[PDB]
Amino acid sequence: GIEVLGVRTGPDSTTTIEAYLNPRMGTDNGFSQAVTVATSLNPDVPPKAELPCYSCARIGLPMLNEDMTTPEILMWEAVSVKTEVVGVTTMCNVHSASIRMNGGYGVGRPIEGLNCHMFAVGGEPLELQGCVQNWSTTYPSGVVAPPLKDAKAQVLDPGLKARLDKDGAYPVECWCPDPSRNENTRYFGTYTGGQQTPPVLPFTNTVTTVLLDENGVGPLCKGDGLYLSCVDICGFYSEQYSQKQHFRGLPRYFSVSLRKRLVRN
Amino acid sequence: IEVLGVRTGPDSTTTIEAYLNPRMGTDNGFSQAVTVATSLNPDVPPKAELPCYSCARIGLPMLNEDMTTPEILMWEAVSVKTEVVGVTTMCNVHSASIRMNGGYGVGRPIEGLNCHMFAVGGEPLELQGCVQNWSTTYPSGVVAPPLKDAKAQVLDPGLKARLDKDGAYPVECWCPDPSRNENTRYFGTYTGGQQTPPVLPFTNTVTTVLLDENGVGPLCKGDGLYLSCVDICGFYSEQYSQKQHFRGLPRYFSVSLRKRLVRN
Amino acid sequence: IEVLGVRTGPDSTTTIEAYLNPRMGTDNGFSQAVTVATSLNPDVPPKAELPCYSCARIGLPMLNEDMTTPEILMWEAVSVKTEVVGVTTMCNVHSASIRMNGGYGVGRPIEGLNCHMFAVGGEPLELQGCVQNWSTTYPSGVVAPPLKDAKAQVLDPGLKARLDKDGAYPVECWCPDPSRNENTRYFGTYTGGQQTPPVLPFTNTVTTVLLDENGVGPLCKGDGLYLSCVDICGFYSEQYSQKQHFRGLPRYFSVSLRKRLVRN
Amino acid sequence: GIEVLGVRTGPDSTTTIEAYLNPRMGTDNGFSQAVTVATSLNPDVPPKAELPCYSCARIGLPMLNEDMTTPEILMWEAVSVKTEVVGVTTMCNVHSASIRMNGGYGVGRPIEGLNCHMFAVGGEPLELQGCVQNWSTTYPSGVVAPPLKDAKAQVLDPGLKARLDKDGAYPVECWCPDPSRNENTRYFGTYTGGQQTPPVLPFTNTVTTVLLDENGVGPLCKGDGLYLSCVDICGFYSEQYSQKQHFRGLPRYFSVSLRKRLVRN
Amino acid sequence: GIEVLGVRTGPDSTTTIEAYLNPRMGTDNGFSQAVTVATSLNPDVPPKAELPCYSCARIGLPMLNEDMTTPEILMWEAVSVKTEVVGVTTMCNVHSASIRMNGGYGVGRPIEGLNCHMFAVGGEPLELQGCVQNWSTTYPSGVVAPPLKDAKAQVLDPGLKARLDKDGAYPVECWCPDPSRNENTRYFGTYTGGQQTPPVLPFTNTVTTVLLDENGVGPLCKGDGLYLSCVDICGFYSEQYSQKQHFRGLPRYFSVSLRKRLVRN
Ligand SMILES: [Cl-]
Ligand SMILES: [Cl-]
Ligand SMILES: [Cl-]
Ligand SMILES: [Cl-]
Ligand SMILES: [Cl-]
Ligand SMILES: [Cl-]
Ligand SMILES: [Cl-]
Ligand SMILES: [Cl-]
C-alpha cells in the first residue's frame, strides 16, 4: 500500500552497496558437522551443527528523511544486483583427504551431490513458508523451525510462516521463500538433487539481474535497510577414512545498485 | 465465443491466488509404499499408491448484472506466476533414507522420475486416457479410463474425460488432451530414469503469459477459474525396508485476470 | 512450382487434426521382446522387434474442379502444433518391471534410447537408406534398403525411398534424406545411451512455423497433407525374464493451412 | 589480402552446392578396426585402421574469370550452409551383436561414449594446429601427423602447422582447427567426452548457419574451389563376445549457398 | 575511477592482439605429476608439481602518450575477444595407456572428470580472493598461497587478497577471481564437478565475447599493457597400470580487438 511517485535524480541520488555473506552450514567455516541419519522417522533428532541455514544481512543505507512529517518522503529503490558465489575454484582440490577414486589409487572425490542455491534482495526481511520432509522431526533449540502439530507441514499449511530475521538460524530444509508474500523482495532459487551429481557453478563479473517489477519499480528499502539473503549448498565432502559426509557451502558476494524514489507518506 | 474489447477502468482487473496440495495417494505429500506386480495380469495398484492430478475451481467475482444482453463480460486469464512450494525440503538427508557411502554417508535425497504440469483454464482440463498396461485393474475411488483392449496403451479417441475431481484422476492413466483444451493452457514436463536428479527452480520473478495468437487468454465460463497440476519430485526410499514412496510438493498460483466483452 | 499470392477471405484457411499410433513392431505401443544376434552374420531381426515410421496422407478440401486454368490453388501448410500423447503413462512403476533397490523398490520406468521425429509435407517424406550392419537380414513385411556392400553403413546415394506405407519402413535402416524433401519440413532428435532418462514435454502452447526463408510452407500436391513421425521413448524391462521391449507413444498433429495461388 | 567490393546480383549470380563426405574412422564403411591400447606411453603404436581422420573435399565451382587481367574479378562467396549428420536413426539398432544389457537378457548397448563433431566451410583448405595427448606416440605410415620432437606437442607448439589437404589422412587426435589462422574458413566443433555418454544427435532440414563475418563477408572461394571438412565420431560399438570397441562415424551432408562477389584484382 | 571521454578514431586507432597461454597443470607440458592424497586434513602437503595454477601474460601495446601530464590522455580499450581452447580433439585419443573400459577389453578411458575453465581480459592484473577447501593445507615452496591462520580461509576472509602477477604460480584451488574488485577486467569462469563427468568442449572461430560494460566501456590498458589470464582443467588422465590420476590442461588462444579511448588525466 505504498503510492510510488517519480524517481529522484541529481547528485548523490544513486549508490552501490557491496556485501558478502559467509555460509551457515551448521558450523561457521563452510562445512556442517558430519551428518547423522535417523534409523526411523521418529525419533529423528538432527543436531544444530548438521543443519544448513539461510544467510541474511540488513545493510544500513544513507538516512533519507530526517523529517517524516511531509506528504512525500524518499526511499532507496534497488534497481539491479550482481552476485557471485566466491571460492568455486576450491572444488578443484582433490588432495585434502576425501574418498579416493579408482579403487583408492586415484584422486579424492571432489565436493559433489545435491546443490541448492538461492539469493534474494528486498526492502524488508524475506518471507518464509514452513515445509518439512518429516513432520515427526525434532528440530534442535537454537534453530527456528515451524511448529509441527500434524503431517500437513509436509505440504502447504498456510499457518506456518516466518520472516528471515536471523542469520544462520532458519534451516533450509524446513523453510522456503513464500511465493504468496514477498511483494517487496525478489528471490531466485535453484535445487539440483541426486546422490553424486556434478556441481555446475559459474563465476563471472559480467551478469546483472534487474530487480524492477512490471511497473518499473524495484524493492523499496523500508527504514533505509537493504535485505540480502542466500544459501549456497555446493554438495558433500566425504571423509576418506570414516566416509562420513559434511555439507559444503560457499560465500556469496552482492553488489546492489540503488536510486532514490519519491513515495506518498 | 465472439471475443470483443477488453473492459478497462476501476475493478476491471483482479489477481487470484491459490495453492493446491499434492495428491500422491495419501494426503500429506507421499504415496503409501509402492507395490509392484510380478506380471501384467493381475496388476492391482492400491489407490494409496497412485499419484493423481490436483485441481481446483475458483469462483470469481460477480461482473454481470444481467446475462440476457447481446454482450456480456467474462474474466480473461492474462498471465500466471506459479511456484512449487517446499523445494528446499529436498535438502533433508537425515530423515531415515538409505545411506550413501556404504551406510556411512548421508541419506539419499528424494530422487528419480519427475513429472511437473500446471494448467490454467476457463473450464475443466480435458484429458485423454492412455495407460502403460491395459490389463491393470484400477482401484475403487479413482477415475480411470475403460480398458476394453490394448489400444488404451496408445491413442483410443473413445477414452476422454474432464479433470473434475481433485485427487481422483491418476497421472499414469490420463494426459492433457491436445485435440481439445481450446480454453486452457497446459505446461508439462516428464524427466524419467531411476535415480535422476530433480531440478527444481523457485523464484517470484517469472510470469507465463496465457494469451493466444489473437491476444485472448482463457475465458472463465460460469465465472470459474480452473487450476490443475501435478508435481512428482521423485521417490523417498525407506532406510530399513528399502520400499519407495512417491513424493509430491504443493504448487502456488497467482493469476492476473481482466474483464473481456464477448457476444452473448 | 511458381508460387504467387496467398488467397485470403472466408474459407481461405483450415486446420487439420490427426493422430498417428506408434508402430514399434506390434499394434499397441510395444515391440515384441527384442532378440540380439551373437555375431554380425547371421543377424535376423523379426518384423515384430523392429520399430517403423508412422505416416498418413490426409485428404484436404478439393481446390480445383478445373485444372486447365493458367493459375490454380494449393493448400499451403504454414504451422503445426504437435504433441506426444501418453507421456504421463511413464509415471507407472507398478506394472511388472525390474525393481530398484535390490528388488524392494518400485519398477524401473521406461528408459534408455529415445528417438523422436515429426514431419509435415505436401508429398511423402523422402528417405535415405543407412544401416549399422550391412549383413543384417531384414524380414519379410518391411521395406529395407538393398544391402549389396558395406557402403550401406555410410552414405550410398543409390539407397533411396519414399515413406509411402505406415508401419513398414524400419527406423534403423532409413533416415530423412537432407538432399531431397524440398516440400517437407522434418524435425528429429536422437538421445542414446543405456538407461538414459527420457525428457518429454507436453504442452498446447508451442507452434512450429513451416514457412521457408521465402515465406512459403509445404504445398499440398493433389490436395494431400503428409504427416510422418516416430516416438521411441525407451525400453520396458520385464521383471522376470529381464527381456526388453521398445515403447513408442502416439503423436497428435494440428496443421494450419491457407490457400496459395500458383502458376499451372 | 583481398579488397572486397560489391555483391554481384542478377540472373546466375547465385548457386547452391550439395555434397556429402563419408566418414574416415580407419576403415572405409563407418567403423574403425577394433581399437588396441598401449600398456605404457612408450611404445604406443596405434595402427592407421584404428585412428579416425578428418573428412575433406574440394568442390569445383563454375569458372568466373576467363580473363584474370581485369582490375576487378569475381569470386564465389559462401553465405550460408545447411548441414546434416546422415544415418542418425541407425543408432536405434540394438540387435546387431553388441554387449547385452540386463546381465545378458536385455537388448544390445547402442553406439555410445565420446562424440566429436566438426564441420567447416571455406575458400581454401582448413588450417590445422598439431597437438597430441602423448608426445611419445608412434603415428603410423599412411597418416600425416605432426613431428613429435619434445613434450611441447602435448600443448601449443606454434611450429606444428598443417593444411587439411587429403581426405582420411589427418588423424583427429593429433590436429585441431588453428584459431590463429582460418581467416577464410568458418569451423564449428563440439567434443562431448566420458565413457558411455549418451550421443545427442539432431536431424532436421530447417536449420541454416550464416557464414558471413562481422563485415558481412563469407568465405571467398580461391581458384573457384569450395572446401568442405568434417568429422562425426558418434561413439563406440562394443562387440558382444570379445568386448573390443570400434569408433563409429556417420556421413555428413552439406548444402552451401554462394553468391558472386566483386574483388580488386 | 577514470572519467572516460570519446573513442579516438582514424588510421591506426584500432589494433588486434593475438596470444596463446600454455597450461600450468604442475609440469610444463599439459599434465600434473601423479596426484597424491592426504589420509587426513593435517598434515596435507600437496607438492607444487600436483597443483594446477592460473596462466597469465601481459602483452605490451603501442605507446600512446609522449606527455603523461596533459589534461586528457589516450588508453587502449579492449572491446571484444575471440578465445579458443586448443587441442580439444586430443581427447579423442583412447589408445595412450589409460584404464581400459569393458573390464579391460575395450578402449582406454578418455580424459574425464572435473572441469574448470576461466578466461579474463583486463587493463591490469586479475584481482584474486583467497579461499581454500582445507585451512590446514601446507602449500608448497614455489607457489603463492593465501596465509592460513584460521578456518575463515575456507569461506570469505576479506584480508586474503592478491593479484595474478606470475604465470604458473597461483594455484586454482586457493584463489578465485575477486568479484569485489576487477572493475577493469572481464572474467568468465565455469566449474563442472563430479567424478567421471564428460568434458563438453566447443571449438569454433565464429564466437566473439564483447568486453564493453553497461556504459559501453571496455577494459582500459594501464601503462599500455593488456592482461590475459586463464585456466583450462579438462579432467583427469588415469594411468592404466598404477591407476594414479593426473590433471590434464589445454592451451588457450586469444584474439583481442582494441581501440584508442580518450580519458581525463
Ligand atoms: Cl528529480
Ligand atoms: Cl562472518
Ligand atoms: Cl489440503
Ligand atoms: Cl490405429
Ligand atoms: Cl550488380
Ligand atoms: Cl566414398
Ligand atoms: Cl576521434
Ligand atoms: Cl610455453
Numbering used by the authors:
A (entry chain BBB), D (entry chain DDD), E (entry chain CCC): 22 to 286
B (entry chain AAA), C (entry chain EEE): 23 to 286
From the paper:
Polyomaviruses are small double-stranded DNA (dsDNA) viruses with a circular genome of approximately 5,000 bp. All glycan-binding polyomaviruses analyzed to date engage oligosaccharide (glycan) structures featuring terminal sialic acids that in mammals are usually presented either on gangliosides, which are molecules composed of a glycosphingolipid, i.e., a ceramide and an oligosaccharide, or on glycoproteins, which contain mostly complex and branched oligosaccharides attached to amino acids during co- and posttranslational modification steps. These sialylated glycan structures interact with loop regions at the outer margin of the major capsid protein VP1, at the apical surface of the polyomavirus capsid, as revealed by X-ray crystallography and cryoelectron microscopy. The VP1 surface exhibits an astonishing plasticity, providing virus-specific interactions for a range of Neu5Ac linkage types and further specific characteristics of Neu5Ac-containing glycans.
In order to probe whether these viruses are able to bind Neu5Ac in a similar manner, and whether differences in regions surrounding the binding site might contribute to subtle differences in receptor engagement, we investigated the structures and ligand binding properties of three representative animal viruses from this alignment: the mammalian ShPyV, which was found in commercial sheep meat, and two avian polyomaviruses infecting geese (GhPyV) and finches FiPyV. GhPyV is a bona fide animal pathogen, as it causes hemorrhagic nephritis enteritis in geese. We expressed and purified assembly-incompetent VP1 pentamers from all three viruses by following the protocol established for HPyV12 and solved their crystal structures at high resolution. Superpositions of the VP1 pentamers of ShPyV, GhPyV, and FiPyV with that of HPyV12 confirm that the core VP1 structure is highly conserved (RMSD values of 0.65 Å, 0.83 Å, and 0.73 Å, respectively). In HPyV12 VP1, the BC2 loop comprising the Neu5Ac-binding site is formed by amino acids T69 to Q83 (T73 to E87 in TSPyV VP1), whereas the putative binding sites in ShPyV VP1, GhPyV VP1, and FiPyV VP1 include amino acid residues T61 to Q75, T57 to E71, and T58 to E72, respectively. We calculated all-atom RMSD values with PyMOL using the BC2 loop of HPyV12 VP1 as a reference. With a value of 1.82 Å, the BC2 loop of FiPyV VP1 shows the largest deviation, while the BC2 loops of ShPyV and GhPyV VP1 yield lower deviations, of 0.77 Å and 0.84 Å, respectively. In the case of avian viruses BFDPyV, CaPyV, and GhPyV, hemagglutination activity has been reported with chicken and human erythrocytes, functionally supporting the sialylated glycan receptor binding properties we report for GhPyV.
